[PDB]
Amino acid sequence: MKLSDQFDKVLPALHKARSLFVKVKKDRQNSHLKNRYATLDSVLDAITPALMDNELMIMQDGERIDVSTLRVETTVMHVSGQWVKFYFDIPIVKNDPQGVGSAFTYGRRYSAAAAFGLSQADDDA
Template structure:
């Protein structure tokens, strides 16, 4: 995409100000089975902004666009019906699998994050009491609570990056490895097939603010693809 907005956006901006005055936080209505953190689904994100957008004559559309092999490109576009002014964004995310299911999963993931970013949607707990409970932060240098027990001969306080390679090569090795990764607020993990039959783990979310923790957990920054990643068995 060469242009991300119309020449004039003043009327659209006024409408979006009204949207952000009335928009509601997206409720965390699902749980990530790998890291057990709660997150807001696409349905929740849409519910939080649909009425605000329609009430201010803003049409929102999202559609896929070509990207490099192994990646999905998604455009999110906001159009002001009365003035015709528009603004858009392009998100590029890795495909977990090179099949329709993988594309659908990546598209759903990209849609909720791209829309949240464009409108400034934040998330909120669906249980007020849970929201008041203090949260316990797990140090990235220790095994997360409720993670599988370490293999025999492996220290229980082993750092996340030091997972036994034989375990990662077993049938459930990748799932065990994901469970051993630190739970970092605002970060989710996604597995992607890599060359040589290996599994690559991508860290997504608010990575800019968590660079130190991701680096300590063995993730590396890829400046070309702009992602934090690591192999499932690399130390």
């Protein structure tokens, strides 16, 4: 984790998003859904709708530190320039454009979910 030079604007806005969030973490559980995956829903319409209202960004560098594993740097930005960086890396298997692309999205889901409290356990197949 790398905090920016200042944290007096991004943090208060980030909390305001939490108190208004309707994400799968809270105010969404029901007796119908049993296994939640949301490979795309975790950011498609889950956190982005309120994050943007709170003058925040969702944006993810995909630098590859090593060939074996692809590093993912999930970051959230504020207009004032403050940010907080989350790191998480995912291994590659087939080492071709199709494989790395499918691994990049998986790493994105884990990093963003962990940085915002979303479980995304997906223990079962």
